Amino acid sequence: GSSGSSGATSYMTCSAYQKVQDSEISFPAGVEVQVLEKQESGWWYVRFGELEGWAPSHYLVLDENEQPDPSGKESGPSSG
Numbered sequence: 431g432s433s434g435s436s437g438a439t440s441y442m443t444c445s446a447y448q449k450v451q452d453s454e455i456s457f458p459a460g461v462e463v464q465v466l467e468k469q470e471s472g473w474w475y476v477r478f479g480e481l482e483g484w485a486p487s488h489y490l491v492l493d494e495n496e497q498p499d500p501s502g503k504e505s506g507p508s509s510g
Contacts, residue, residue: 440464441476441490455483463490 440462449456455478457463463476463485473484 436466438464438466441492443489444491445489447485447489449483451484453483454485455481457485465490 443457443459443461443463446459447456455476457476457478461478463478465474465476466482467475468487469475469484472487474487474490475482476485476490
């Protein structure tokens with residue numbers, strides 16, 4: 431292929447976020463954004479079109495694995 435990116439991940443906004451600082455940017459609920467940077471506090475730098483603001487990973491949807499299994503096993507941890 432062609433490696434030409436700074437290793438980023440695009441997320442989907444599910445909740446309208448409101449910018450608190452002139453730097454941050456507010457986006458509607460139902461759009462896509464690119465996470466440029468990531469803070470250890472939870473605020474990631476996203477880009478919406480021609481603007482870039484720091485939005486909380488809480489408003490952004492993450493593609494995590496969810497497998498709610500009943501944990502039904504014929505047997506348990508034997509030898510105990």
